C-alpha cells in the first residue's frame, strides 16, 4: 500500500512541477517596474510590454519565442532555450509514466530521476543566464541607466522569477525522491 | 556508500542492461500516442486561454 | 500603481513553500522507511 502510494504522490508532484515549469516559461511577468522606473512595463524571456506614456499606460506588447529578431539579447535566447529543454525533459518523463506497464519500476524511476535532474540543471542554467541579459538597451531604457548585469536597479523580480526558483527546488527534490524510490522496493 | 550504494551503480542502472529491443513496438504503442497528446494539450493551452 | 507587487510575491512564496514542505515531508517519510 505504502509503495504505490508514495509512487502516486511522486507522480502528482512531478505533474505539478511540470505545470509550474510551463507557467514560468510562458508568462512574461519575471521582472517588473517601480516608482523610480521612468517607463512602466514588464519583460520576461521573450515576451515584453513597455509603456508608451502618452496619457495612461497603453502598454505596447512585443516579443515571442517563435521570432528570434525580437529577443533583447542572446542571454535571454539561451535562457529560453534552456527552459525549453527543461519543459521537454519533464514532459518526456510524464510520458514515461505511461511506460510502467512494460518496463520494470526500478528502471523507469531511474530514468525519470536522471530526466528530472537534467531538467533541473537546464532550468538553473537558464535562471543564472537570465540576469546577464539585462544589459540590453531596451532593458536599460525601461528599468534605468544603473540597471545592468546582475543589477536590478529600479526594477524588481516579480512572482514568476521566484516561482522559477521554486520550480528549481521542486526539480531537485523530485529528482532525489525518484533516485531513492528506484533503488527502494 | 552513504545510506545508498556505489555512486555509479546506485544512480546508473547499468546492471541487467540490452537485447530487449524486440519489445519496442509494445513501448511505442503507448509512448508515441501519449507524448503527442501531452504536446497537443500544452499547445492548445499555450494559445487559447493564456496567449 | 502598486509598483512593488508585494502581496503577489508573498502569496506565491507561501504557495511555493507549502509545496516544497509537502515534497520534503514525503521525502522524510520515505527515508524513515
Ligand atoms: C513531445 C514532448 C516530448 C515535447 C513537447 C514540447 C512542446 C510542448 C513545446 C516544443 C516547442 C514549444 C513552443 C515553442 C514556442 C512557443 C512560443 C511562445 O510564445 C508560446 C509557447 C510556444 C508555443 C511553445 C509551447 C510548447 C512547445 C510546443
Ligand atoms: C492487451 C493487448 C493490447 C494492449 C495495447 C496497449 C494499450 C492501448 C494503447 C493505445
Swiss-Prot record, chain A:
CC per GO annotation: dendrite; GABA-ergic synapse; inhibitory synapse; plasma membrane; postsynaptic membrane; postsynaptic specialization
One Gene Ontology MF term: GABA receptor binding
The protein's role, per its UniProt record: Plays a role in the regulation of inhibitory synapse formation and function by being involved in maintening gamma-aminobutyric acid receptors (GABAARs) clustering and their associated scaffold proteins at inhibitory synaptic sites. Acts in concert with NLGN2 to recruit or stabilize GABAARs.
Keyword Transmembrane attached: yes
Lineage: Eukaryota, Metazoa, Chordata, Craniata, Vertebrata
Membrane topology category: Multi-pass membrane protein
Name under which the protein is recorded: LHFPL tetraspan subfamily member 4 protein
Origin species: Homo sapiens (Human)
The keyword Cell inner membrane is assigned to this record: no
From Swiss-Prot, chain B:
Cellular location(s): Postsynaptic cell membrane; Cell membrane; Cell projection, Dendrite; Cytoplasmic vesicle membrane
Post-translational modification: Palmitoylated by ZDHHC3/GODZ; required for the accumulation of GABA(A) receptors at the postsynaptic membrane of inhibitory GABAergic synapses.
Transmembrane segments: 27-47
Extracellular compartment spans: 48-50
Subunit structure: Heteropentamer, formed by a combination of alpha (GABRA1-6), beta (GABRB1-3), gamma (GABRG1-3), delta (GABRD), epsilon (GABRE), rho (GABRR1-3), pi (GABRP) and theta (GABRQ) chains, each subunit exhibiting distinct physiological and pharmacological properties. Interacts with GABARAP. Interacts with KIF21B. Identified in a complex of 720 kDa composed of LHFPL4, NLGN2, GABRA1, GABRB2, GABRG2 and GABRB3. Interacts with LHFPL4. Interacts with SHISA7; interaction leads to the regulation of GABA(A) receptor trafficking, channel deactivation kinetics and pharmacology.
Domain notes: The extracellular domain contributes to synaptic contact formation.
Family: Belongs to the ligand-gated ion channel (TC 1.A.9) family. Gamma-aminobutyric acid receptor (TC 1.A.9.5) subfamily. GABRG2 sub-subfamily.
Protein task: Gamma subunit of the heteropentameric ligand-gated chloride channel gated by gamma-aminobutyric acid (GABA), a major inhibitory neurotransmitter in the brain. GABA-gated chloride channels, also named GABA(A) receptors (GABAAR), consist of five subunits arranged around a central pore and contain GABA active binding site(s) located at the alpha and beta subunit interface(s). When activated by GABA, GABAARs selectively allow the flow of chloride anions across the cell membrane down their electrochemical gradient.
Name this polypeptide is given: Gamma-aminobutyric acid receptor subunit gamma-2
Parent-protein start and end of this portion: 416 to 475 of 475
Curated annotation (Swiss-Prot), chain C:
Name of the featured protein: Neuroligin-2
Quaternary context: Interacts with neurexins NRXN1, NRXN2 and NRXN3. Interaction with neurexins is mediated by heparan sulfate glycan modification on neurexin. Interacts (via its C-terminus) with DLG4/PSD-95 (via PDZ domain 3). Interacts with PATJ. Interacts with GPHN. Interacts with MDGA1 and MDGA2. Found in a complex with MAGI2 and IGSF9B, where it interacts with MAGI2 (via WW 1, WW 2 and PDZ 2 domains). Identified in a complex of 720 kDa composed of LHFPL4, NLGN2, GABRA1, GABRB2, GABRG2 and GABRB3. Interacts with LHFPL4; leading to mutual regulation of the protein level and synaptic clustering.
Chain segments annotated as transmembrane: 11-31
Function per UniProt: Transmembrane scaffolding protein involved in cell-cell interactions via its interactions with neurexin family members. Mediates cell-cell interactions both in neurons and in other types of cells, such as Langerhans beta cells. Plays a role in synapse function and synaptic signal transmission, especially via gamma-aminobutyric acid receptors (GABA(A) receptors). Functions by recruiting and clustering synaptic proteins. Promotes clustering of postsynaptic GABRG2 and GPHN. Promotes clustering of postsynaptic LHFPL4.
Subcellular location: Cell membrane; Postsynaptic cell membrane; Presynaptic cell membrane
Chain residue ranges for the region called Required for interaction with LHFPL4: 11-31
Full-protein positions shown: 668 to 700 of 835
Tissues in which the protein is found: Expressed in the blood vessel walls. Detected in colon, brain and pancreas islets of Langerhans (at protein level). Detected in brain, and at lower levels in pancreas islet beta cells.
Family named by the database record: Belongs to the type-B carboxylesterase/lipase family.
Superkingdom in the source lineage: Eukaryota
Amino acid at each position: 500500500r505504502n509503495s504505490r502510494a508514495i509512487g502516486v504522490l511522486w507522480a502528482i508532484f512531478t505533474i505539478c512541477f511540470a505545470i509550474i515549469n510551463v507557467v514560468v516559461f510562458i508568462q512574461p511577468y519575471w521582472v517588473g517596474d517601480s516608482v523610480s522606473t521612468p517607463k512602466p512595463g514588464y519583460f520576461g524571456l521573450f515576451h515584453y510590454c513597455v509603456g508608451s506614456g502618452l496619457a495612461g499606460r497603453e502598454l505596447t506588447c512585443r516579443g515571442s519565442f517563435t521570432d528570434f529578431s525580437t529577443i533583447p539579447s542572446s542571454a535571454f535566447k539561451a535562457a529560453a532555450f534552456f527552459v525549453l529543454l527543461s519543459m521537454v525533459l519533464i514532459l518526456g518523463c510524464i510520458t514515461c509514466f505511461s511506460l510502467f506497464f512494460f518496463c520494470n519500476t526500478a528502471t523507469v524511476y531511474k530514468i525519470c530521476a536522471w530526466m528530472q535532474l537534467l531538467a533541473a540543471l537546464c532550468l538553473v542554467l537558464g535562471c543564472m543566464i537570465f540576469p546577464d541579459g539585462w544589459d540590453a538597451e531596451t532593458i536599460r531604457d525601461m528599468c534605468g541607466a544603473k540597471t545592468g548585469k546582475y543589477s536590478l536597479g529600479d526594477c524588481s523580480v516579480r512572482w514568476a522569477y521566484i516561482l522559477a526558483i521554486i520550480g528549481i527546488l521542486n526539480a531537485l527534490i523530485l529528482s532525489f525522491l525518484a533516485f531513492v524510490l528506484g533503488n527502494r522496493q | 556508500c552513504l545510506d545508498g550504494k556505489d555512486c555509479a551503480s546506485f544512480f546508473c542502472c547499468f546492471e541487467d542492461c540490452h537485447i530487449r529491443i524486440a519489445k519496442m513496438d509494445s513501448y511505442a504503442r503507448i509512448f508515441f500516442p501519449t507524448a503527442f497528446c501531452l504536446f497537443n494539450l500544452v499547445y492548445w493551452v499555450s494559445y487559447l486561454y493564456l496567449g | 500603481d502598486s509598483r512593488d507587487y508585494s502581496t503577489e510575491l508573498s502569496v506565491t512564496v507561501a504557495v511555493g513553500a507549502s509545496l516544497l514542505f509537502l515534497n520534503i515531508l514525503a521525502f522524510a517519510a520515505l527515508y524513515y522507511k
